[PDB]
């Protein structure tokens, strides 16, 4: 409690300046547009940003951040930024002069894992709901995440889940509430 904690670095990119924070969650983007929309890194120019999996928040809540925003919000786990950068550099140096095949394998694997990670934000199954309900009549939902074991299930705001997973919600009640 009392400050957020970096749990894992999921990705890295150069995007528009200021396209970080809450407005970068997949649901914020789906509901209000990607603040990094139409960013042709080609004439802009951007800044180094990192996609963060936060401690205690499901992958649906991942946000893009910079070394600066991280520091600004006094997040814990900053040491992980240093390791990530060093590992990243090591990886670059070791792939410096690498056969086309080596580059081939690398790009392939990175896509496999990139896709895998995207599934972590998709509800595979609703498992239960809350007795309490929001003022708007939404109960929270216990979600099973695609690609992750049941130990990663988490309760999620009903309104949020309904905006994209109304099907899972419907099927949940259909198998008899």
């Amino acid at each position: 409690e009392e400050f957020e904690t970096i749990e894992r670095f999921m990705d890295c990119r150069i995007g528009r300046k200021g396209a970080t924070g809450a407005t970068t969650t997949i649901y914020a983007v789906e509901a209000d547009g990607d603040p990094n929309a139409g960013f042709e890194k080609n004439k802009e120019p951007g800044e180094i940003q990192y996609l963060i999996k936060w401690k205690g928040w499901s992958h649906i809540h991942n946000t893009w951040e910079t070394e600066e925003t991280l520091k600004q919000q006094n997040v814990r786990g900053m040491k992980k930024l240093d390791n990530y950068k060093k590992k990243d550099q090591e990886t670059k140096r070791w792939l410096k002069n690498a056969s086309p095949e080596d580059v081939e394998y690398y790009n392939c694997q990175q896509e496999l894992t990139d896709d895998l990670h995207k599934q972590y934000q998709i509800v595979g199954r609703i498992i239960a709901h809350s007795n309490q309900k929001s003022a708007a009549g939404y109960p929270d939902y216990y979600c099973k995440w695609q690609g992750l074991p049941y130990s990663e299930c988490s309760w999620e705001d009903g309104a949020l889940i309904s905006k994209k997973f109304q099907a899972c919600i419907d099927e949940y009640f259909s198998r008899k509430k």
């Binding site: 809540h61 929270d140 309760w155 705001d157």
Partner: peptide, 5 residues
């Protein structure tokens, strides 16, 4: 439940 408001 909490969201990135």
């Amino acid at each position: 439940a909490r969201t990135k408001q």
